[PDB]
TrEMBL record, chains A, B:
Residues 25-255 form the AB hydrolase-1 domain. It holds the Pfam family Abhydrolase_1. The active site is at 101 (nucleophile, proton donor/acceptor), 250 (proton donor/acceptor). It comes from Pseudomonas fluorescens. The keyword DNA-binding does not apply. GO terms for molecular function: hydrolase activity. Keywords: Hydrolase. This is 2-hydroxy-6-oxo-7-methylocta-2,4-dienoate hydrolase. Coiled coil: none annotated. Transmembrane segments: none annotated. One of its GO terms (cellular component) is membrane. The keyword Lyase does not apply.
Length: 271, 271
């Protein structure tokens, strides 16, 4: 299973992660869909970025192949502490961070709580500001295993449904039923789910204080996180650039891979 | 005067233009401020693009050093015909077009009337959709010569006013009073000026029919053309990407030069 990489103790949790490349460190933080993992989310991104940066892609506690501690208390603060724990474990004193959706909310929170540890930020379809729960997100977080339920989620993430094949739906369905996955996932974002969008999001007041060079990316047709969210982040963050991809869903790193990789690498190259 | 380049008869008008580079043709269309010229608008863009493309930057009829025909009837259609006339004169059968503000409105109109002559489009703070006249645009089009009036316009175009020096204000003021310049300029967009925004703009219906790969660029703090205009173009044009630069005014090619040039060159490189 290529989704399994290296193991390291971070913030007291045995963590699965990928470490590719040399130089300036970049931490990639995945989204929160069923069966998600750092590799699944970033497999098309790591190759490009690792040619110029040291890329760290960990499975956040409660997701992927990282340990799922018994009675573990999941929260934005706990996840941020995990990110910092991973950085501490790898002696990464300061790094750029790329956060996808759920991971984007975590990126912002990390930049707010540990400003000295974060350099540049890329927020991709980030859950960083409050928005009324979408059916797309309600479906993602309310997922129960089945090939058709997964096919529907893949459709929700994509603009071009031709990318959603029986094979992909089957493979991700299998990923979602691995030992303990659905168990921790189903209890992660229970109804009412608006609570979790509100929890992950940061206040306008706090976001306005961010000094970081930021690149905000969003797919125009994103069905999970509304474009309006990134437009808002674009007005709140001072040193921010906003890039919207037309004919692209939530999956910007997947549906606009080359454009995405170019934008991100060049953004970091400026530093 | 470096603003003066080569001369060619286009659409029956003796036209001043710059032609730098080799390969795929790219036409740069300047804005409509007092004293404007292709060189003044694009001097920091041409060097970068010409390394990979043949760049044509003409002074639109009624502006710069191109002839100002007696009793000439200025209109969106006449300007579009001038662009096509320039392309015809240079045997440019199909080209990419970069349009700034007024020039962006012309780019859209050219793509609509002569679709077979246009490949990719870059719309920079384009006047392509209707918006209520801004004080910034009212001041630009209502300009009468003076160092202070020009300093104010430069302030209107910039986010970082440190870029607006006494020297720059003086030089552009001098450009604005050249023989016949203020005369043709003052009669170009007379009050009420809302009429000209409405005239330059294209309908939602027409814009939605554009098949061109498009890159929409806007400075978040643009005081001349509101960001909302480009956000609208981003929802109307099918194959469009939207890029908004924070801490940047109307002058995206001037205030975010390297980022702008990189985005544009790479966008064209895809073709
Ligand atoms: Cl998510
Ligand atoms: Cl203009």
């Amino acid at each position: 299973n290529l989704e399994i990489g290296k193991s390291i103790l971070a913030a007291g949790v045995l963590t699965n992660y990928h470490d590719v490349g040399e130089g300036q460190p970049v931490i990639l933080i995945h989204g929160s869909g069923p069966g998600v993992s750092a590799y699944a989310n970033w497999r098309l991104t790591i190759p490009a970025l690792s040619k110029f940066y040291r890329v760290i892609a960990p499975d956040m506690v409660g997701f992927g192949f990282t340990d799922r501690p018994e009675n573990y208390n999941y929260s934005k603060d706990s996840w941020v502490d995990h990110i910092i724990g991973i950085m501490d474990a790898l002696e990464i004193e300061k790094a750029h961070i790329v956060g996808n959706s759920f991971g984007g909310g975590l990126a912002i929170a990390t930049a707010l709580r540990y400003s000295e540890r974060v350099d540049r930020m890329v927020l991709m379809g980030a859950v960083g500001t409050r928005f009324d729960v979408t059916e797309g997100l309600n479906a993602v977080w309310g997922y129960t295993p089945s090939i058709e339920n997964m096919r529907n989620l893949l459709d929700i993430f994509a603009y071009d449904r031709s990318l959603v094949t029986d094979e992909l739906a089957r493979l991700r369905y299998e990923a979602s039923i691995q030992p303990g996955f659905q168990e921790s996932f189903s209890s992660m974002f229970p109804e009412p789910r608006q609570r979790w969008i509100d929890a992950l999001a940061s206040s306008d007041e706090d976001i306005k204080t961010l000094p970081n060079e930021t690149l905000i990316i969003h797919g125009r047709e994103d069905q999970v996180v509304p474009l309006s969210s990134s437009l808002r982040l674009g007005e709140l963050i001072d040193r921010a650039q906003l890039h919207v991809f037309g004919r692209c869903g939530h999956w910007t790193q997947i549906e606009q891979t080359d454009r995405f990789n170019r934008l991100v690498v060049e953004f970091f190259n400026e530093a």
